[PDB]
């Protein structure tokens, strides 16, 4: 419908999808049908992108290919790894399925328009660097790097997040320079102080070592341990370090975050503003198609229809009458009107789903929308909680009475696949997928049903571990505490934080994956027998990894939490012998600790502060 090309586009303004094709000459118009089918394609790609990115943890390492002992607990590792005969198939498969997706934009874009767009040219550019590796691998250095790189821009949420980092990255280098001058100047005054004293052994390499130590003391990871010989020479030596750590942590390290916070708050206001201009680009598009006379304004009889399919197709406002004209007695105004319909009149109605009779289903559908059903599943999870605490508490007692209660938990898992099956049937798959909590339950109910088929066709620890975890589907009981006025902002922020922090937690995560590809290449060994035991002992327990990519992934996490992080840096230094290997650890800290982790803090607070002004606005 000529009028429906705009109502559907008005709900696209409220729902906020993003596409940039101006002309186009549900059902709208031609360019839309070129892109419309991408949705199933996008859903199937979703699995491909995940597996493409994971082809690097499951990848076979590069240092085992030469000498010496092949696939041993020596130079430790723990995953399935890979055989290239079984590797290239996935390279070929993931690549081929990928290439269909990267050139699919030309369907809805122009031929030259696709090639000239900076997004699609780099997309195909990393698409051409992964094909050459595959051909050469068939008959390996920067091959995993394009996996994560083609992954970070394969998703828009990670892409706009990386762009947000760019605008604030410039001011971040200038404060790092001042941070460097502080470390530089503080290292100087510290070294001269302790050249004619006993701590000349810690300042033996002098400024080169004393800057390295004042740098880790800036992280306080070695606070009582780095200046303990000086504190043994004179008690008044501590006066310097409490002075330094004070300024270093409470003055320096604090206002560093205050920079990111403001720079992040600025760039986020830049992103949502351009998001508004983009959203209005569809709203002005919809209006521009119903204003045929180009005068800039629409008539009554020309807008009574636009409301008429807005009240029917999308949301529930009112009913049209002959009193329509009784209530009666521009381009930029229509956008505000639908945005006002978007907050009050808007409650996205059910899409279809049938060639079927409502009769037999009509019973179940009304009794399931009743609030008493919401209380029923609630009490079912309460009686499930007191049930789970008994099965688990009978494992610790080791009494064999853990068995009868643990099979009753399986019947609880059947209550929820019933609940999943009856609720998706009584609301529609799209309405059931609209709310965030129901998407979760669906995929966690489906991790139970694949467990049931597996656990019972396969044949305790085969069933206890795989099922007792999914009591996490009883975690929406925490929404109860939002009724308490105190904890409302806390839980409501946290709940709204879990998804909103995920694009930022996936970005910092991809950094480790680039970093782990580097650590694998540069640190393949570990002189494995005399340098391993001399370097670390209590920390050799810690440095039992980073010879494997998952081992490297968990140890970058240990460096990401910064818990005894310097024991990896100081060791891999003397495992390589040169001071230039600690740069990998200095570059890590600067890029993720002083930057990415400082960023996610400002996001949480700003998200919490936005939750405050929101609950303040309702009253």
Ligand X SMILES: COc1ccc([C@@H]2N[C@@H](C(=O)O)Cc3c2[nH]c2ccccc32)cc1CN1CCN(c2ccccc2F)CC1
Residues found near ligand X in the complex (CB under 6 A):
184-185, 188, 389, 393
CB 565, min distance to a second copy, A: 9
* CA dist., res. 245 & res. 213, Å (int): 12
Pick one of Ca ion, ligand X, a second copy, none as the site partner of residue 145 (Cβ within 5 to 8 A by kind): none
List, in order, residues 6 or more apart from 291 with CB less than 8 Å away: 297, 298, 331
Cβ nearer to a second copy, comparing 114 with 261:
261
Find the part of the chain contacting Ca ion (CB under 5 A) among 152-160, 222-230, 509-517, 573-581.
Answer: 222-230
In the DSSP assignment, the letter for residue 17 is -
Examine residue 55 and tell whether it contacts Ca ion (CB under 5 A).
Answer: no
Q: Up-side HSE of residue 111: CA atoms within 13 Å toward CB?
A: 0
Asked whether the beta carbons of 21 and 108 are under 8 A apart, the reply is yes
Q: Which of 19, 137, 452, 539 binds Ca ion (CB under 5 A)?
A: 137
CB 435, min distance to a second copy, A: 21
Pick one of ligand X, Ca ion, a second copy, none as the site partner of residue 333 (Cβ within 5 to 8 A by kind): none
Cβ nearer to a second copy, comparing 304 with 501:
501
* CA dist., res. 398 & res. 412, Å (int): 22
CB 116, min distance to a second copy, A: 36
Q: Name the residue among 293, 385, 275 with its Cα closest to residue 330.
A: 293
CB 260, min distance to Ca ion, A: 29
* CA dist., res. 222 & res. 216, Å (int): 7
List, in order, residues 6 or more apart from 38 with CB less than 8 Å away: 104
* CA dist., res. 56 & res. 515, Å (int): 12
Cβ nearer to a second copy, comparing 422 with 471:
471
CB 217, min distance to a second copy, A: 9
List, in order, residues 6 or more apart from 539 with CB less than 8 Å away: 564, 567, 568, 571
Find the part of the chain contacting Ca ion (CB under 5 A) among 190-198, 474-482, 497-505, 575-583.
Answer: 190-198
Distances in Å between the alpha carbon of 129 and those of 73, 85, 135, 292, 345? 34, 21, 10, 49, 51
CB 510, min distance to a second copy, A: 15
Find the part of the chain contacting Ca ion (CB under 5 A) among 48-56, 218-226, 277-285, 332-340.
Answer: 218-226
* CA dist., res. 423 & res. 436, Å (int): 14
Cβ nearer to Ca ion, comparing 283 with 298:
298
In the DSSP assignment, the letter for residue 123 is H
Cβ nearer to a second copy, comparing 3 with 492:
492
CA 439 to chain centre: 17
Cβ nearer to a second copy, comparing 16 with 242:
242
The pattern of x and - marking residues 473 through 512 that bind Ca ion according to CB under 5 A reads ----------------------------------------
Q: Name the residue among 38, 201, 177 with its Cα closest to residue 106.
A: 38
Pick one of a second copy, Ca ion, ligand X, none as the site partner of residue 184 (Cβ within 5 to 8 A by kind): ligand X
Examine residue 538 and tell whether it contacts Ca ion (CB under 5 A).
Answer: no
Cβ nearer to Ca ion, comparing 436 with 563:
563
On the question of a cis peptide bond just before residue 282, with omega within 30 degrees of 0, the verdict is no
Beta strands in 133-252 (DSSP E): none
Q: Which of 196, 322, 329, 617 binds Ca ion (CB under 5 A)?
A: 196
Asked whether the beta carbons of 131 and 96 are under 8 A apart, the reply is no
Cβ nearer to ligand X, comparing 188 with 490:
188
Q: Which of 168, 298, 306, 387 binds Ca ion (CB under 5 A)?
A: 298
CB 389, min distance to ligand X, A: 5
Examine residue 291 and tell whether it contacts Ca ion (CB under 5 A).
Answer: yes
Pick one of a second copy, ligand X, Ca ion, none as the site partner of residue 137 (Cβ within 5 to 8 A by kind): Ca ion
Examine residue 308 and tell whether it contacts Ca ion (CB under 5 A).
Answer: no
- Sign of the Cα torsion 52, 53, 56, 57 reads negative
Cβ nearer to ligand X, comparing 234 with 393:
393
- Sign of the Cα torsion 512, 513, 518, 524 reads positive
CB 187, min distance to ligand X, A: 7
Cβ nearer to ligand X, comparing 185 with 433:
185
Pick one of Ca ion, a second copy, ligand X, none as the site partner of residue 298 (Cβ within 5 to 8 A by kind): Ca ion
Examine residue 293 and tell whether it contacts Ca ion (CB under 5 A).
Answer: yes
- Compute the C-alpha angle 100/104/108, nearest 5°: 170
Cβ nearer to ligand X, comparing 46 with 385:
385
CB burial of residue 384 (10 Å; 0-12, 13-18, 19+): buried
Residues contributing to the site for Ca ion (CB under 5 A): 137, 196, 224, 291, 293, 298, 542, 545
């Amino acid at each position: 419908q000529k009028a429906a090309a705009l109502v559907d586009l008005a709900e696209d303004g409220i729902g906020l999808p993003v596409e940039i094709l101006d002309q186009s000459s549900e059902s709208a118009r031609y360019y839309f049908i070129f892109t419309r089918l991408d949705l199933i394609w996008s859903l199937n790609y979703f699995a491909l992108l995940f597996l493409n990115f994971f082809e690097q943890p499951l990848w076979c390492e590069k240092n085992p290919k030469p000498s010496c002992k092949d696939r041993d607990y020596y130079y430790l590792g723990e995953l399935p790894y890979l055989t290239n005969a079984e590797s290239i198939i996935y390279e070929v498969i993931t690549l081929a399925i990928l290439l269909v997706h990267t050139f699919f934009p030309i369907s809805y874009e122009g031929s030259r328009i696709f090639w000239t767009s900076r997004l699609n040219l780099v997309k195909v550019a990393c698409v051409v660097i992964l094909f050459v590796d595959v051909l050469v691998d068939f008959l390996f250095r920067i091959a995993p790097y394009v996996r994560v790189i083609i992954f970070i821009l394969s998703i828009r949420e990670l892409r706009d997040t990386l762009v947000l980092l760019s605008g604030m990255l410039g001011t971040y280098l200038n404060i790092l320079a001042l941070w460097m001058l502080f470390l530089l100047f503080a290292s100087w005054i510290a070294f001269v102080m302790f050249e004619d004293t006993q701590q000349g052994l810690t300042v033996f390499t002098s400024y080169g070592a004393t800057l390295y130590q004042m740098f880790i003391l800036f992280t306080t990871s070695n606070n009582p341990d780095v200046w303990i010989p000086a504190y043994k020479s004179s008690r008044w030596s501590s006066v310097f370090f409490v002075l330094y750590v004070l300024i270093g942590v409470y003055f320096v390290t604090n206002l560093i975050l205050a920079v990111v916070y403001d720079s992040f708050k600025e760039q986020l206001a830049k992103q949502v503003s351009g998001m508004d201009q983009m959203k209005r680009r569809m709203l002005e598009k919809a209006f521009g198609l119903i204003d045929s006379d180009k005068n800039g304004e629409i008539d009554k009889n020309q807008c009574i229809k636009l409301f008429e399919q807005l009240t029917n197709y999308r949301t529930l406002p009112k009913i049209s009458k002959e009193e329509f004209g009784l209530i009666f007695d521009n381009k930029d105004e229509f956008a505000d009107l639908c945005q006002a319909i978007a907050l009050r009149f808007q409650k996205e109605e059910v899409p279809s789903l049938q060639i079927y009779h409502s009769a037999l289903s009509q019973q179940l559908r009304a009794f399931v929308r009743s609030p008493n059903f919401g209380y029923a599943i609630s009490f079912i999870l309460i009686i499930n909680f007191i049930a789970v605490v008994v099965e688990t508490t009978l494992d610790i007692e080791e009494s064999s009475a853990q068995k009868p209660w643990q099979v009753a938990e399986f019947v609880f898992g059947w209550i929820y696949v019933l609940e999943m099956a009856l609720k998706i049937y009584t609301y529609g798959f799209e309405n059931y997928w609209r709310e965030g909590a129901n998407r979760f339950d669906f995929l966690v109910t489906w991790v139970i049903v694949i467990g049931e088929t597996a656990t019972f066709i396969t044949p305790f620890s085969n069933g206890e571990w795989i099922r007792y975890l999914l009591l996490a589907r009883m975690l929406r009981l925490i929404r109860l505490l939002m009724n308490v006025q105190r904890y409302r902002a806390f839980i409501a922020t946290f709940i709204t934080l879990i998804p909103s922090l995920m694009p930022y937690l996936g970005t910092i995560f991809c950094v480790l994956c680039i970093y782990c590809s580097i650590g694998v290449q540069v640190f393949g060994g570990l002189g494995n027998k005399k340098l391993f035991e001399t370097e670390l002992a209590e920390d050799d327990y810690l440095l039992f990894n980073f010879n494997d990519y998952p081992n490297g992934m968990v140890t970058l996490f240990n460096l990401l939490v910064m818990g005894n992080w310097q024991v990896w840096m100081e060791s891999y230094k003397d495992l390589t012998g040169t001071w230039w290997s600690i740069t990998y650890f200095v570059s890590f800290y600067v890029i993720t600790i002083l930057l990415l982790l400082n960023l996610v803090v400002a996001f949480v607070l700003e998200a919490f502060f936005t939750e405050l002004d929101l609950e303040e606005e309702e009253k």
